[PDB]
């Protein structure tokens, strides 16, 4: 009775081209796609418009030195971006760019002409250029008490998740699907409601975030306690949803060695195009209408489920290392700089970002 | 977007959503935009 999903998996593997690279070239198609709207060149007038519109934080690079306007709406997110730029700036040509550190992208596709803004997440309906989010170093959500200074240090979190995965080999993992997060999108509601109706099937509960105003923000129940990502690994089936934009949760779940259930296919981060449905994770319809069938399928095809989980874990382990993040920043900014059709001059009043 | 939904405030500070802006009200002992600095 599972032939349909089984054939989809076979088909998806037949389509799959594994990335054999030892560097971040796996993702070069993402850079190429994101820069396609600017292939006619980025003029000085275009840059002045982006800056005037305050769509992001204005950075400049000249003579391998980084300069920035005074204002950054989220200093910790600017600091996280700066961490990676400063790592690679000795090899970057002169350029300037506007780096949006808000959650949401800034350049809808219907805007003509396209203007260049760097954002961490988009859909295909935006012309923003994706960059590796600040949180790979610092500045992700400060979820009290588990991440009191903000979710960050991907290098360390990788180590902790791999160790947790080793403590929870697949056959020892719990078969109840699992989610702990806040109500950043109502697309999450059907899972929380299914969990309340069928708690043996799904354990999905709303935590609160710093915008909480009332019980509406948790669908009328007391907020759940926050749970460290390393404590997700005891569950075989881990759900991932959009929030405001894409979520930082996603990459972590793979390293548990658990099978990721990824809901929807619109909101991206730069690495998402290399993660393939049925190869690396289970795709779930945006409206969750097939979630019960998918959960029955994986339980009845546990060998297939494990193979998918192992492939997804291996992809993040091998192709989303800290070095891949630094590499992507370097290749992204180097390629982008080619499309600036004029010579950048440091702006009056921009301090240098050291060291 | 209410910028507080992504918890920009560290160290159990309170986030206030202003017109397309945010403010972190620190617990005593902390300061800075994100309440990241120990006073
Ligand atoms: O109990 C929790 C709740 C959240 N998070 C993490 O905190 C971040 C913010 O999660 P939330 O669901 O609040 O918002 P999102 O960013 O997913 O929209 C994500 O990386 C979550 O994985 C967590 O580790 N444990
Ligand atoms: C990156 O890897 C590709 C092969 O995957 C190779 O062609 C390229 O030369 C490598 N680049 C560097 C700078 O190592
Ligand atoms: C599996 O986890 C679910 C949800 O947290 C829990 O209700 C259930 O008791 C667990 N089962 C076992 C066998 O540990
Ligand atoms: Ca706000
Ligand atoms: Cl935001």
Residue numbers in the entry:
A (entry chain A): 31 to 385
B (entry chain B): 453 to 491
Paper excerpt:
POGLUT1 is an inverting GT-B fold (CAZy GT Family 9018) glycosyltransferase and its EGF-like domain substrates sit in a cleft formed between the canonical N-terminal and C-terminal domains. Here we report the structure of human POGLUT1 in complexes with three different EGF-like domains and either UDP, a donor substrate analog or a slow substrate. The structures reveal the basis for POGLUT1’s ability to recognize diverse EGF-like domain substrates and for the requirement that they be folded. The three EGF-like domains studied are positioned almost identically in their respective complexes and 25–30% of their surface (740–830 Å2) is buried by POGLUT1.
Among the EGF-like domains studied here, EGF(+) (C1ASNPC2) and hEGF12 (C1VSNPC2) do not possess a diserine-containing motif, while hF7EGF1 (C1ASSPC2) does. Of the EGF-like domains studied, hEGF12 and EGF(+) contain an asparagine residue at the Xb position (C1XaSNPC2) while hF7EGF1 contains a serine (C1XaSSPC2). In all cases, the asparagine and serine sidechains make a strong hydrogen bond to the backbone NH group of Gln240. To explore this further, we assayed hEGF12 and EGF(+), substrates lacking diserine, and found that they can both be readily xylosylated. The ability to xylosylate hEGF12, an EGF-like domain possessing the C1XaSNPC2 motif found in 36% of POGLUT1 substrates, shows that POGLUT1 has the potential to xylosylate many more EGF-like domains than previously thought.
